[PDB]
Amino acid sequence: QWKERVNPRKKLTPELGEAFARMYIPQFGSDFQFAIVEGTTDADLEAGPGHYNDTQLPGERGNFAVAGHRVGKGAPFNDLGNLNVCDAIVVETRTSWSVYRVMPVDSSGQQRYDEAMGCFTPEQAERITHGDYEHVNGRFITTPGDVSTISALPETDVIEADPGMEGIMTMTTCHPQFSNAERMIVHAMLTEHFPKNGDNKPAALEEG
């Protein structure tokens, strides 16, 4: 008789409304982990973050964007305002581990560079300070119609992923704290991405 050979494997396009990934924020403690579902309908956002369907997936150049609730028992995104630059967001899929790091917040010029140099490559730091990512704030408040926040190159008119892009991860939630009038946006940039098969999970998980 014969047997299936099992391996870390996943569908190319996540099944609608199903969990296809898991995210961790070590700065928020080891217990902080949420499944990510495909889709951003009310039903999808019920048990945790949902992936915006037309955006990139984890580890991809472009923008991997998710929405999540802010209020409620076990809302995933109530404390995004407490993230600091270089804080890790770890994303697991069935085949891979990705580490994103929160981009510099509100700073510009020399201070932005120095902050970026804390966890990004010197090349990424330059792009963040003076290059294609100069305009991209790690956290800000915006209006519900701000659709370019989830564009492949955030807050631009570039929608198609391109090989020259960094990997971005975007988290969106309501704002202010007990309201849905506005939206909070957080951007983090990809610093690690590698396949499973082996016990090697990112060192970033041990932080905080």
Of 177, 195, 200, 207, which one interacts with Cl ion (CB under 5 A)? 177
Looking at residue 64, its amino acid is F
CA–CA dist 87, 115 (Å, integer): 11
Find the part of the chain contacting Cl ion (CB under 5 A) among 3-11, 63-71, 83-91, 169-177. 169-177
Residue with token string 């190159």: 153
Yes or no: say if 55 and 67 are a contact pair by the CB < 8 Å rule: no
Yes or no: say if 125 and 117 are a contact pair by the CB < 8 Å rule: yes
Q: Per rule CB under 5 A, is residue 108 in the interface with Cl ion?
A: no
Q: How far is the CB of 76 from Cl ion (least distance, A)?
A: 18
Q: Provide the 10 A C-beta neighbour count for residue 58.
A: 24
CA–CA dist 45, 35 (Å, integer): 10
Active site residue 174: yes
Q: Per rule CB under 5 A, is residue 176 in the interface with Cl ion?
A: yes
Cα-based torsion angle of the residue sequence 31, 52, 153, 166 in order, rounded to the nearest 10 degrees: 40
Q: How far is the CB of 189 from Cl ion (least distance, A)?
A: 29
Q: Per rule CB under 5 A, is residue 180 in the interface with Cl ion?
A: no
Strands 182-195 and 33-38: unpaired
Choose between 17 and 176: whose C-beta lies nearer to Cl ion.
Answer: 176
Q: Per rule CB under 5 A, is residue 181 in the interface with Cl ion?
A: no
Of 82, 179, 180, 200, which one interacts with Cl ion (CB under 5 A)? 179
Q: How far is the CB of 181 from Cl ion (least distance, A)?
A: 9
Active site residue 51: no
Yes or no: say if 139 and 148 are a contact pair by the CB < 8 Å rule: no
Find the part of the chain contacting Cl ion (CB under 5 A) among 4-12, 126-134, 135-143, 177-185. 177-185
Of 42, 72, 145, 178, which one interacts with Cl ion (CB under 5 A)? 178
Q: How far is the CB of 178 from Cl ion (least distance, A)?
A: 4
Catalytic residues: 69, 174
